[PDB]
Write an enzyme that holds these catalytic residues in place. Structure first.
Site, short mmCIF file in Angstrom:
data_model
loop_
_atom_site.label_atom_id
_atom_site.label_comp_id
_atom_site.label_asym_id
_atom_site.label_seq_id
_atom_site.Cartn_x
_atom_site.Cartn_y
_atom_site.Cartn_z
N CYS A 1 -6.12 -13.91 8.46
CA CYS A 1 -5.83 -13.52 7.07
C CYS A 1 -7.00 -13.79 6.13
O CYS A 1 -7.36 -12.93 5.32
CB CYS A 1 -4.57 -14.25 6.58
SG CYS A 1 -4.72 -16.04 6.43
N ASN B 1 8.94 -15.50 -3.24
CA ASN B 1 10.21 -15.87 -3.85
C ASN B 1 11.37 -16.12 -2.89
O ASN B 1 12.48 -16.40 -3.37
CB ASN B 1 10.62 -14.80 -4.87
CG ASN B 1 9.77 -14.85 -6.12
OD1 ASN B 1 9.55 -15.92 -6.69
ND2 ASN B 1 9.25 -13.71 -6.54
N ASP C 1 14.04 -17.92 -0.41
CA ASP C 1 14.63 -19.24 -0.20
C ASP C 1 14.56 -19.63 1.27
O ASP C 1 14.42 -18.79 2.16
CB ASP C 1 16.08 -19.26 -0.67
CG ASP C 1 16.23 -18.89 -2.13
OD1 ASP C 1 15.24 -19.03 -2.88
OD2 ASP C 1 17.33 -18.46 -2.53
N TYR D 1 -0.99 -22.63 11.69
CA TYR D 1 -0.83 -22.63 10.24
C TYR D 1 0.16 -21.58 9.77
O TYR D 1 0.66 -21.67 8.65
CB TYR D 1 -2.18 -22.40 9.55
CG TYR D 1 -2.71 -20.99 9.67
CD1 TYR D 1 -3.44 -20.59 10.78
CD2 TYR D 1 -2.50 -20.06 8.66
CE1 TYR D 1 -3.92 -19.30 10.89
CE2 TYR D 1 -2.98 -18.78 8.76
CZ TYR D 1 -3.69 -18.40 9.87
OH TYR D 1 -4.17 -17.12 9.95
#
Lengths: 125, 722, 722, 125
Positions: free
Chosen positions: B307, B429, B431, B553
């Protein structure tokens, strides 16, 4: 501070309608982009403009004026092909022979003022 | 014949065509003296890097000996004719041409009209001076001009035809995006932000974990020799239509899609296998420069990326074309969310974590780019920073890059606008949901944590290496009404919450639990402390479990390196603390790259049945590589660079690669050591001859068969040459 | 190791896994009497095509012996146990499983609870009867359920874990989209529209040009044996995530991108080369069935396709999965518009058409699909028909399919919404511009025609073969204010007009010009007549030019077969008529397929400089193929089909292929005739055994080394078998 | 016929704002979907709902009611993590030790109404 601008015939950035109690009132010298719906324009003829919060409130005011429509005139012709005319834009029409414009001319250009034509287009006798 | 198109697509900048040196038209009389009309003898572009054009266009940094200018802004050229110019009869124009099939209405053939004044937003040329045989033009390009390398010609009109200069590769002109021009879609209204997000060639990438943030330098090197040509080659391999390369949205949309290679046809092969056979480990790369030049020369995907590597390469690409860009790191990124706002953890009935069902994983960090542009495809209020993630995930098109999604849309949940905004919103965002998987096969939602995902978002600060928190640019302050308004707006536009947490309530036990892991050096023991507090006059008994796991990671686990159980009494209105010592012999034989550990503490209160669940990462600290220098830090003078690495492990490192980099200071270089016995130190020395003055950075990295993701850096002042 | 993902992507429906026949829980004792728990001896799906399950689900048409049901609606099964079920002591459930990595939170493992009442929108099973050892269940699927072929298991819970049925491929159940269920996103509230757009397997495709609309039948054949499995294979070859296949938006977005094959990925290789070497000519295909089966069996892109072939195959795919869909044809389509609302024609100074610069073309017709769905990703009121052009176009994301773009958004110009809406809007709302390319190199806009693009849009009428005009569904009545409002709204959201048509105006002369081309049978001479009419008391002299071009149906010209010049003097208020004869020998040697001709008439009035310009197309009529039937038209009886074709040319046709098709009447068949002498006729006879009753259609086509795009059809009533 | 609805705190389909004079006034039995902004909900507690044109105008009435906020409850507690509550939903609150609610109990339930909570959350000493 400047309250929520009620844009007429137009909109501000559409999250401000949901998050209204967060963003408003705005601090002075904050700028806000607003835009007109189709068929309307800002007084400059722009579809979109920045207003600015001032001690005078929002300046210039977020007001969108309606476009003038192509007139239903007879005994004559309109040179411009378009149906709707911007505010402060002007348009040319002309008479058949034996007729004279509202201004008494052979051809007349009239402007769509801040609301409505500066004169009603007509070819009289 | 070919009925699909009247002319083939003009989708390569490297392609050229043979413009006629003379276009005769109609009947031409016999013995016409064409040399009555002007012949162009020479053209001067004032292209030198110290000279007005490149300085005022902010293109003098490029290691390129052709003219490079930014669209929407005027520049000087001089034309020398065979005879003095006579405005009453000598008609001529400059022509800019790009690709093999240039067309004027497609903007790929551009006749520059001579004009008395340059209009705003129009191509034109003003005769600012005349001097015997010569005319000096101020040319202006359209602020919507195609970005790329244009051929230049001068064409003189006659009653008989057009006379044109032959192909002169010395006059080829790069036209770039112009963050300095108020009419350009990439206009950036602050000079420090232009200086950082366009003209800065050294980035900082943030990794580690939100309680132990780690930094590394990254050479973007967008100015280095051949990088601009490599970005053009990247767009040519995308087969991107040249008429589309004037648009920063489409250039971002296609360039990001080129960054990750699926099969062939892409810059980098993504791999997370920890082996990286037949390639370079993603944690070895020091910068984009050698990746891009390897791609340009091998013409095949480079092995391997991850990434931050994708974000580094795409940030180089954007800054090189002139789109303002930065990398941002999100901590606890909910990647592969499929626009679901819920990550599920499964628990055994006794409250232990069900490792068989728990397959959602939260990435300790993730990197993506922000690019600065206006969004004329969207309504007002969505310009500025656009999030582009070149890491593929399942979106509405498929397994692809996401974005550009407007960050101002994401913050307000207005994810109905293109592109891929619901998946970027869900990345920041979501949960966590803790679910008991009962033995009867029913699922019961036990607990919810809205606070964990996207806890912090960071980027490099302007003018320094410190972090800037930008979390409040992506989402509102947590626990406030505006967060809920954004969530509801996102749920209106196709974000999802598959499980109704409507029935979840706070634990009526009024017990609370939290635990801490102390930061540690790789190979040291460290303590984990679990705390319980009873805020009630009830006595309770609690069973609690610790599961400690070694992970990538990305949060993907490899082994459960430690597991322990506690039975605890909490007497009325009290508090209790458990401690655990974790030793090096438990984890050291098993660690993956970036040395990441993840701890679950979960407990069930026996009397009330409530579940308490917490989880925390940590990243072991690996000692830095040391860079030193000797001699005259002067441009063109020799300077000696020493790279020093000390093996920190109890074991012999094998096949140790050390990389060294630093834009304007050294080309990318690497050195191989067969073995580095513990705890012995290797040194490497190079003589390098810096070519860029001012503050510069040297960057080094280490990789091996068993240790990698080790970095080092040094700031150096390089004096201007005498 | 593999750190990218905790489990590999569940993206193939063909892939399976081996669920354990026993899952042990706890320390299971030695020699547990598991025979006290229930064991399943048989499962009945009532899957017969005449039975209530397929009749009420409208899945009895499919030539498939497995159970097929539509999501969101209940269906019966029966389970036979080793002993009577006893709710006090017996827990069991049905499991539906799809793919290799099924997960409950991903929706790919589906436990169906036994319930007292079927909750709306929830997976559940109701015991509707018990008798001896057998329980009969009514099972309801979720209306958001994944669409595909689920495996089925029955699992009994015990204190010692799960006992489960072994793999029984007899029980595999196709779950499809449900246009009949009010909660399904594809819900269609009209019975006859559901009958047409889902259950009809014979389409009609409209071609030719708007003044001479030609028609042909097309076998969608979505119910034919193996077509449903082929649509699943198409989604597996896309590697489409199974959890995404519940969404009709994503299914349309991926399947359309799968339709056009770029490289060796996708169903059809596009070709317009008029030669079609090493493949089948696009005008030879009678239907989707043999294309899809050739794709499924070769695993490679089929050669070759064109817009209506892509639309037919995608329509079969959509209707097969159960998304309501139709083909629509737009006449005068501005394809490859790049969201530009302007098509430029270039003229010489004398007013002749400049063929050198005039490289834009307007397609005589173009075909795309509409799919019916709600759009929960967009704001309210953009549901319904979604335009999906499976033909690749230069797009916001390079060269790709466009859409699904909401037709309701397109009509109102809200092209800010996804996907690709500006390009579809420009397909139907562009203007022609006529530009004088002056000899000095300046471009002057001479004329504008806002009326030509998208003059009509048509589709097959419900329950018949007449055209239904749907033009008003895509755009408002031309010249009214609502068209201007739609245009301005599109210009707000990134539609473009490069040239400001403000320096263009009504003609000063007030002279009208128009011309008519009469329709002709292929190989006949025909008259073209030009009229000029003076509405003024002035006298005018006019020079006018006729250019006649042979073109592909895409409007790409091949040869100027006729060129003519007229000098006209118009007296005050007078008119004049010019008659031009076009002879067969001028065009017959040179015609492309679909036999399309395009005429420009242009003129300049000498006294006023005004330019008059109009263009029109014709398609030459080619005689139909004749189909006849003999013997009893009864299912299972032998029926004799005669296909007759008469060569219309004055040349020998060579390598003539005749194709025959008709879903439920005959499989795709083709026949090779080595030569057909100029006036000669061929007959082909087959014996076919129809297997579907009611009204059916036979379809035939012809192609050769020269003539192709020749069709025929016959309606056959087939009586039910005794 | 039914006029252009004034959906306060809500919206109809966006083109109707531009094409108003074309679509309105609307014939009987046309159905028009509307939706409330975030922070607001329809009478039924839905986000999106349909109105129908009738001889009496629009029915049901296009009104959007603001969600009641969680109280800054003095000397008390709430059961819920929720910040916002549906119209005509209800909420349970209770007392610190030694305190009594507005209704004098240890615990009280309050309904979200058009003007706020049916009773103000408060615990008296």
């Amino acid at each position: 501070p400047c309250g929520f601008p009620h844009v007429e015939n137009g909109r501000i950035a559409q999250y401000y309608y949901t998050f209204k109690s967060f963003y408003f009132p705005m601090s002075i010298d904050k700028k806000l982009s607003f835009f007109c719906l189709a068929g309307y324009t800002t007084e400059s003829g722009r579809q979109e403009e920045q207003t600015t919060c001032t001690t005078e409130g929002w300046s210039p005011e977020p007001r969108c004026f309606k476009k003038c429509t192509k007139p239903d005139l007879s005994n004559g012709y309109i040179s411009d092909v378009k149906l709707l005319y911007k505010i402060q834009e002007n348009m040319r029409y002309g008479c058949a022979s034996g007729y004279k414009t509202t201004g008494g001319k052979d051809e007349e250009v009239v402007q769509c003022l801040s609301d409505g034509w500066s004169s009603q287009p007509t070819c009289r006798k | 014949f070919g009925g699909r198109r009247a002319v083939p697509p003009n989708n390569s900048n490297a392609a050229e065509d043979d413009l006629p040196t003379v276009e005769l038209q109609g009947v031409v009389p016999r013995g016409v003296n064409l040399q009555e009309f002007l012949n162009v003898t020479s053209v001067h572009l004032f292209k030198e890097r110290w000279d007005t054009n490149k300085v005022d266009h902010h293109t003098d940094k490029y290691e390129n000996n052709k003219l490079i200018v930014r669209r929407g802004q005027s520049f000087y050229v001089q034309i020398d004719f065979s005879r003095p110019y006579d405005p009453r009869r000598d008609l001529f124009r400059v022509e800019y041409v790009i690709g093999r099939y240039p067309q004027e209405n497609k903007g790929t053939y551009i006749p520059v009209p001579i004009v008395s004044e340059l209009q705003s937003g129009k191509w034109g040329a003003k005769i600012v001076m005349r001097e015997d045989r010569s005319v000096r033009l101020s040319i202006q390009s359209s602020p919507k001009c195609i970005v790329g390398k244009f051929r230049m010609y001068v064409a003189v009109w006659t009653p008989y035809g057009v006379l044109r200069t032959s192909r002169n590769p010395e006059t080829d002109t790069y036209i770039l995006f112009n963050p300095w021009c108020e009419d350009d879609a990439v206009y950036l209204d602050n000079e420090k932000e232009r200086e950082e997000y366009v003209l800065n060639d050294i980035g900082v990438i943030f990794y580690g974990e939100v309680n132990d943030i780690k930094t590394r330098s990254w050479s973007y090197g967008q100015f280095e020799d051949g990088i601009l040509d490599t970005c053009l080659y990247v767009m040519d391999r995308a087969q991107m239509d040249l008429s589309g390369r004037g648009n920063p949205i489409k250039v971002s949309r296609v360039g990001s899609a080129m960054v990750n290679a699926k099969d062939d046809e892409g810059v980098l092969v993504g791999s997370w296998d920890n082996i990286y056979a037949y390639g370079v480990p993603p944690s070895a790369w020091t910068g984009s420069v050698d990746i891009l030049l390897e791609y340009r020369s091998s013409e095949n995907p480079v092995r391997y990326g991850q990434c931050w590597v994708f974000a580094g390469v795409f940030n180089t690409f954007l800054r090189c074309l002139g789109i303002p860009a930065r990398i941002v790191t999100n901590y606890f990124s909910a990647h592969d969310n499929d626009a679901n706002l819920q990550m599920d953890i499964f628990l055994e009935e006794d409250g232990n974590v069900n490792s068989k069902l728990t397959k959602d994983s939260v990435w300790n960090y993730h990197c993506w780019n922000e690019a600065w542009m206006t969004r004329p495809d969207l309504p007002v209020g969505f310009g500025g920073w656009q999030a582009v993630d070149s890491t593929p995930q399942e979106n509405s098109d498929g397994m692809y890059r996401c974005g550009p999604a407007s960050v101002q849309a994401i913050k307000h949940g207005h994810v109905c606008f293109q592109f891929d905004a619901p998946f970027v919103f869900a990345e920041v965002n979501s949960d966590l949901i803790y679910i008991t998987a009962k033995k009867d096969g029913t699922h019961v939602v036990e607990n919810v944590d809205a606070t964990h995902i996207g806890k912090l978002i960071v980027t490099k600060q302007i003018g320094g290496d410190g972090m800037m928190d930008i979390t409040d640019t992506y989402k509102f302050q947590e626990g406030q009404e505006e967060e809920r308004l954004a969530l509801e707006t996102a749920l209106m536009y196709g974000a999802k919450k598959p499980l109704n947490t409507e029935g979840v309530m706070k634990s009526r036990s009024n017990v609370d639990m939290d635990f801490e892991v102390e930061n540690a050096v790789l190979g040291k023991d460290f303590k984990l402390s679990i705390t319980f507090r009873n805020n009630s006059h009830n006595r309770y008994t609690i069973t609690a479990y610790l599961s400690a796991n070694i992970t990538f990671y990305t949060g993907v686990p490899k082994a459960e390196f430690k597991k322990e159980t506690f039975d605890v009494t909490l007497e009325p209105l009290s508090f209790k603390k458990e401690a655990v010592l974790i030793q090096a012999g438990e984890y050291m034989g098993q660690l993956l790259e970036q040395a990441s550990l993840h701890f679950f503490v979960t407990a069930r209160i026996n009397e009330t049945r409530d579940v308490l669940a917490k989880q925390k990462s940590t990243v072991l600290t690996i000692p830095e590589i040391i860079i030193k220098v000797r001699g005259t830090q002067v441009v063109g003078s020799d300077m000696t660079v020493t790279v020093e690495f000390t093996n920190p492990l109890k074991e012999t490192l094998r096949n140790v690669w050390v990389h060294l980099d630093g834009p304007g200071v050294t080309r990318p270089m690497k050195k191989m050591f067969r073995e580095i016995r513990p705890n012995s130190t290797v040194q490497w020395e190079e003589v390098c001859r810096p070519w860029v003055s001012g503050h510069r950075k040297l960057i080094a990295s280490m990789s091996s068969d068993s240790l990698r993701h080790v970095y080092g850096e040094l700031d150096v002042q390089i004096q201007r040459r005498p």
